[PDB]
Amino acid sequence: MFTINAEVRKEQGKGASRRLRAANKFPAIIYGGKEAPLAIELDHDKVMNMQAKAEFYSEVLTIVVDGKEIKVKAQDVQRHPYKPKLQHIDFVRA
Amino acid sequence: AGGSTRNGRDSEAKRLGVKRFGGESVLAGSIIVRQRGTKFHAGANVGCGRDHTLFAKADGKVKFEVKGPKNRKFISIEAE
Amino acid sequence: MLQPKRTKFRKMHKGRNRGLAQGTDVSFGSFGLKAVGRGRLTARQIEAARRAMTRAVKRQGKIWIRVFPDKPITEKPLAVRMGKGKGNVEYWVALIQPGKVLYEMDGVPEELAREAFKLAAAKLPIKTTFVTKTVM
Amino acid sequence: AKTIKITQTRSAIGRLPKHKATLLGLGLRRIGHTVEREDTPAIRGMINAVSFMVKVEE
Amino acid sequence: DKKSARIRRATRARRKLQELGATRLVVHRTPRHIYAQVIAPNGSEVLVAASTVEKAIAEQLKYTGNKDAAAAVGKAVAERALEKGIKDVSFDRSGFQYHGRVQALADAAREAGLQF
RNA sequence: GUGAAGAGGGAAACAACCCAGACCGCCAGCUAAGGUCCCAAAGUCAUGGUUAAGUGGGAAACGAUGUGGGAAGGCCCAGAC
RNA sequence: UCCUCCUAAAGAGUAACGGAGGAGCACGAAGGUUGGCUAAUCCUGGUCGGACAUCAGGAGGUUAGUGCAAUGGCAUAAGCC
RNA sequence: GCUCAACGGAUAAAAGGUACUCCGGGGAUAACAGGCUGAUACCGCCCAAGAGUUCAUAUCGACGGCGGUGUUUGGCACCU
RNA sequence: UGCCUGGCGGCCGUAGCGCGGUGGUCCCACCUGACCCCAUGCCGAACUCAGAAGUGAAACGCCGUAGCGCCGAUGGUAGUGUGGGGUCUCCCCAUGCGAGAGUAGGGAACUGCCAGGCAU
Ligand SMILES: [Mg+2]
Ligand SMILES: [Mg+2]
Ligand SMILES: [Mg+2]
Ligand SMILES: [Mg+2]
Ligand SMILES: [Mg+2]
Ligand SMILES: [Mg+2]
Ligand SMILES: [Mg+2]
Ligand SMILES: [Mg+2]
Ligand SMILES: [Mg+2]
Ligand SMILES: [Mg+2]
Ligand SMILES: [Mg+2]
Ligand SMILES: [Mg+2]
Ligand SMILES: [Mg+2]
Ligand SMILES: [Mg+2]
Ligand SMILES: [Mg+2]
Ligand SMILES: [Mg+2]
Ligand SMILES: [Mg+2]
Ligand SMILES: [Mg+2]
Ligand SMILES: [Mg+2]
Ligand SMILES: [Mg+2]
Ligand SMILES: [Mg+2]
Ligand SMILES: [Mg+2]
Ligand SMILES: [Mg+2]
Ligand SMILES: [Mg+2]
Ligand SMILES: [Mg+2]
Ligand SMILES: [Mg+2]
Ligand SMILES: [Mg+2]
Ligand SMILES: [Mg+2]
Ligand SMILES: [Mg+2]
Ligand SMILES: [Mg+2]
Ligand SMILES: [Mg+2]
Ligand SMILES: [Mg+2]
Ligand SMILES: [Mg+2]
Ligand SMILES: [Mg+2]
Ligand SMILES: [Mg+2]
Numbered sequence: 058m059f060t061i062n063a064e065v066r067k068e069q070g071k072g073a074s075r076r077l078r079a080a081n082k083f084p085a086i087i088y089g090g091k092e093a094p095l096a097i098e099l100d101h102d103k104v105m106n107m108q109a110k111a112e113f114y115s116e117v118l119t120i121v122v123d124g125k126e127i128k129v130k131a132q133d134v135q136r137h138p139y140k141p142k143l144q145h146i147d148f149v150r151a
Numbered sequence: 152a153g154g155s156t157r158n159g160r161d162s163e164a165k166r167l168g169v170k171r172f173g174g175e176s177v178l179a180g181s182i183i184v185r186q187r188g189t190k191f192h193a194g195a196n197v198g199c200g201r202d203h204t205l206f207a208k209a210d211g212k213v214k215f216e217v218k219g220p221k222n223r224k225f226i227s228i229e230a231e
Numbered sequence: 232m233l234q235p236k237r238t239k240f241r242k243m244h245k246g247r248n249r250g251l252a253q254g255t256d257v258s259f260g261s262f263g264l265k266a267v268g269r270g271r272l273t274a275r276q277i278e279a280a281r282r283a284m285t286r287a288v289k290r291q292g293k294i295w296i297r298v299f300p301d302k303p304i305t306e307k308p309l310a311v312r313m314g315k316g317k318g319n320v321e322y323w324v325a326l327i328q329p330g331k332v333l334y335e336m337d338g339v340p341e342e343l344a345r346e347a348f349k350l351a352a353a354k355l356p357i358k359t360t361f362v363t364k365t366v367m
Numbered sequence: 368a369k370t371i372k373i374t375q376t377r378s379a380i381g382r383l384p385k386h387k388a389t390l391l392g393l394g395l396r397r398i399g400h401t402v403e404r405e406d407t408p409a410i411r412g413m414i415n416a417v418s419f420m421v422k423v424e425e
Numbered sequence: 426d427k428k429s430a431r432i433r434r435a436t437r438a439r440r441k442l443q444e445l446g447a448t449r450l451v452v453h454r455t456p457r458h459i460y461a462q463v464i465a466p467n468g469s470e471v472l473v474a475a476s477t478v479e480k481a482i483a484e485q486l487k488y489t490g491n492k493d494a495a496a497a498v499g500k501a502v503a504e505r506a507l508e509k510g511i512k513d514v515s516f517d518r519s520g521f522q523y524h525g526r527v528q529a530l531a532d533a534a535r536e537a538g539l540q541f
Numbered sequence: 542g543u544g545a546a547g548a549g550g551g552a553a554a555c556a557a558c559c560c561a562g563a564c565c566g567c568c569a570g571c572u573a574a575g576g577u578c579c580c581a582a583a584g585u586c587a588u589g590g591u592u593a594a595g596u597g598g599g600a601a602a603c604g605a606u607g608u609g610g611g612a613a614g615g616c617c618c619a620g621a622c
Numbered sequence: 623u624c625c626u627c628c629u630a631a632a633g634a635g636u637a638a639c640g641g642a643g644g645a646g647c648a649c650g651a652a653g654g655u656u657g658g659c660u661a662a663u664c665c666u667g668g669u670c671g672g673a674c675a676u677c678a679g680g681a682g683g684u685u686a687g688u689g690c691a692a693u694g695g696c697a698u699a700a701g702c703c
Numbered sequence: 704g705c706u707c708a709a710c711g712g713a714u715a716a717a718a719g720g721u722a723c724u725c726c727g728g729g730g731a732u733a734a735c736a737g738g739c740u741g742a743u744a745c746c747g748c749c750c751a752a753g754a755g756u757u758c759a760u761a762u763c764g765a766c767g768g769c770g771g772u773g774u775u776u777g778g779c780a781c782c783u
Numbered sequence: 784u785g786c787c788u789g790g791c792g793g794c795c796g797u798a799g800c801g802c803g804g805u806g807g808u809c810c811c812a813c814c815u816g817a818c819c820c821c822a823u824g825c826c827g828a829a830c831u832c833a834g835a836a837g838u839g840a841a842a843c844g845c846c847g848u849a850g851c852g853c854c855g856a857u858g859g860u861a862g863u864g865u866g867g868g869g870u871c872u873c874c875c876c877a878u879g880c881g882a883g884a885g886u887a888g889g890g891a892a893c894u895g896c897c898a899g900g901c902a903u
Contacts, residue, residue: 275766275767307742309776312779352750355768
């Protein structure tokens with residue numbers, strides 16, 4: 058089990074996503090199921106540590122947003138081209 | 152000192168293209184498109200010339216549209 | 232020395248080398264040598280770094296080369312004025328963007344791949360780094 | 368009746384011809400020239416286009 | 426195969442009448458029956474129709490797929506067209522040869538009063 | 542786009558860069574870029590950090606217990622180094 | 623001198639002793655019209671007959687063809703009788 | 704009826720030499736030198752396969768890489 | 784009005800392939816024959832004509848099926864107009880536009896006119 062804390066993104070696009078990656082964060086999206094897709098943003102160093110395990114990309118993860126846990130799986134991740142960093146993560150609702 | 156070349160040639164620009172665009176009122180006989188092949192095709196009230204030139208047979212607005220199973224591009228004149 | 236057998240055309244424009252790369256992840260092998268900088272390599276630089284890691288592994292394991300030099304580079308001869316046609320094709324390069332994985336390797340330990348890719352990156356003009364395979 | 372103040376705050380010397388025509392459409396002539404225009408989307412589009420060299424007041 | 430090559434054989438003159446804006450008579454030929462219908466220049470609706478599948482025509486006949494049936498069909502569709510006020514049409518052979526039952530039909534429609 | 546055909550202020554000086562377009566006059570005021578210890582007009586301003594190289598105030602591959610910050614890790618008062 | 627593509631920056635146009643190729647004709651049918659047809663290649667079998675003639679079937683679906691260079695077109699064929 | 708193809712075609716009809724030369728002009732255009740640049744050149748440096756009895760680094764240093772100078776051969780044609 | 788079929792369209796792959804099944808009263812198809820209309824650069828194969836014994840084998844139509852083809856978000860990324868900036872062969876900031884590929888997912892078309900048949 059991996060428990061990740063998130064916040065709903067108040068704004069999207071290039072300037073916001075660049076500005077989160079400036080402030081040590083990165084966006085992600087939870088989609089799948091019948092629920093509408095949810096645009097979250099994460100702390101980078103926590104998830105970068107958590108993703109080093111294959112358990113991360115195999116198990117079911119719990120995402121806490123507004124105190125509401127969502128059990129997901131890591132569908133796809135966009136990485137930085139030459140730096141050990143994360144751009145964006147897809148989460149499918151398990 | 153020395154050298155030469157074999158690649159000096161080129162031809163004159165034939166000024167093809169679309170002379171009147173969509174929603175653009177024309178007179179009868181006005182050239183709409185000059186083109187080599189039938190990159191476009193003649194629809195309603197539009198004739199195709201000897202060199203695949205698309206001209207208006209009547210007066211009105213140009214209508215671009217995609218029809219047919221092959222998704223070919225047709226040019227038609229709406230009435231006006 | 233890598234070189235295309237046939238080409239549709241003998242010469243090519245100089246172009247540019249802007250943008251990010253596509254061959255980013257370690258596809259085939261386990262360890263990779265990823266380019267961080269930007270530039271153009273050659274068949275000599277590629278073959279010299281291949282020799283340095285083949286010898287550093289004592290031909291143990293398997294080495295992939297992800298890049299290939301397909302761009303011809305012309306030069307004009309000495310004491311030739313700037314006109315009178317394009318210069319003669321002299322050598323072949325591969326345009327390298329940041330993020331391009333240059334080489335891959337497996338069948339060896341990690342530390343041996345580190346020291347082999349370090350001996351190879353010492354033969355390369357651009358700045359490189361060491362990468363490993365990743366699930367997803 | 369929904370009118371706003373527009374004030375040219377920079378020069379128009381090295382600017383584009385399209386930006387000079389935009390300042391002509393706003394009626395701005397010199398720097399510090401405060402003009403009073405109605406508030407339409409067309410006006411807001413010209414102010415959007417030259418927002419670097421104007422100062423809209425309200 | 427034969428159906429498709431007949432359609433390819435017909436789809437040039439059909440598109441030509443499509444751009445001519447022609448009210449068009451459509452013939453269809455089978456070994457047993459023969460069909461006819463007058464189609465609006467939009468190609469989406471018919472005006473009159475006749476066949477050897479209709480009782481009023483087939484019951485007066487020996488066999489539905491001979492020339493006498495085809496002439497009775499072209500006569501009936503012409504008399505219905507002139508009843509409805511359709512006079513000038515253009516004959517679509519629909520990929521058949523202008524020969525035999527098709528020719529006897531169009532000759533019957535010409536004789537009954539259509540102009541094509 | 543500017544110069545050419547355009548002066549003024551700045552970039553030490555520096556047609557083409559930055560700011561800005563000279564009708565004339567005034568021992569009036571506000572500002573732009575750029576600046577505020579002295580040459581030389583204006584902060585030896587305030588608050589919090591970094592640098593010890595005159596770095597600032599010229600340069601790469603590469604090399605190094607320079608130093609500041611951050612996140613994690615493995616040994617450890619059953620005694621670590 | 624003329625044609626085609628790129629350079630040419632998604633309208634047109636756009637230069638260099640820039641990158642690559644052609645033309646200075648042919649056809650009394652290789653034109654017009656009506657009617658009809660649909661390739662390349664490969665597989666199997668089959669007299670001489672063979673990698674490869676012609677014949678029959680199947681895959682394929684225009685990778686062929688276009689009087690000639692290239693490009694754009696071409697199944698309603700502009701291709702073939 | 705023109706390969707007037709130097710293809711908007713100077714005439715129906717035309718090749719060369721000048722160190723015996725001359726005039727008008729040009730730094731709009733070359734040679735010298737200066738300038739910009741630094742491909743080349745020269746001088747360094749990086750990795751270290753190997754040679755060096757063993758031993759890469761005493762001395763050398765393959766395959767390749769990064770710089771400096773303005774010093775050669777050159778490029779341009781900004782001054783004259 | 785329902786079902787089925789034929790013709791002509793609309794639309795142009797969410798509509799196409801594949802795999803399996805199914806249909807014959809009518810329709811359609813194959814099918815029988817050909818001195819004739821007409822036809823084969825030979826051949827009734829095709830075209831055509833005269834027909835209706837047989838069969839739905841093929842073809843066609845319908846139903847089912849996600850092996851494909853196809854469609855396809857959200858978010859992000861690339862790019863880029865204007866303005867500004869840097870370590871200026873290339874990037875960054877504000878703002879506006881915003882892909883492609885890929886993912887989730889969808890998905891085994893929909894519809895009009897006329898005519899016929901069987902039911903209603
Ligand atoms: Mg931006
Ligand atoms: Mg000035
Ligand atoms: Mg000045
Ligand atoms: Mg200076
Ligand atoms: Mg000064
Ligand atoms: Mg003041
Ligand atoms: Mg200031
Ligand atoms: Mg002072
Ligand atoms: Mg102080
Ligand atoms: Mg263009
Ligand atoms: Mg353009
Ligand atoms: Mg024909
Ligand atoms: Mg054979
Ligand atoms: Mg032809
Ligand atoms: Mg001349
Ligand atoms: Mg001339
Ligand atoms: Mg003289
Ligand atoms: Mg000069
Ligand atoms: Mg001069
Ligand atoms: Mg000189
Ligand atoms: Mg220098
Ligand atoms: Mg030793
Ligand atoms: Mg040494
Ligand atoms: Mg060497
Ligand atoms: Mg010198
Ligand atoms: Mg020199
Ligand atoms: Mg010049
Ligand atoms: Mg001088
Ligand atoms: Mg089936
Ligand atoms: Mg038959
Ligand atoms: Mg069957
Ligand atoms: Mg998007
Ligand atoms: Mg998309
Ligand atoms: Mg489907
Ligand atoms: Mg199906």
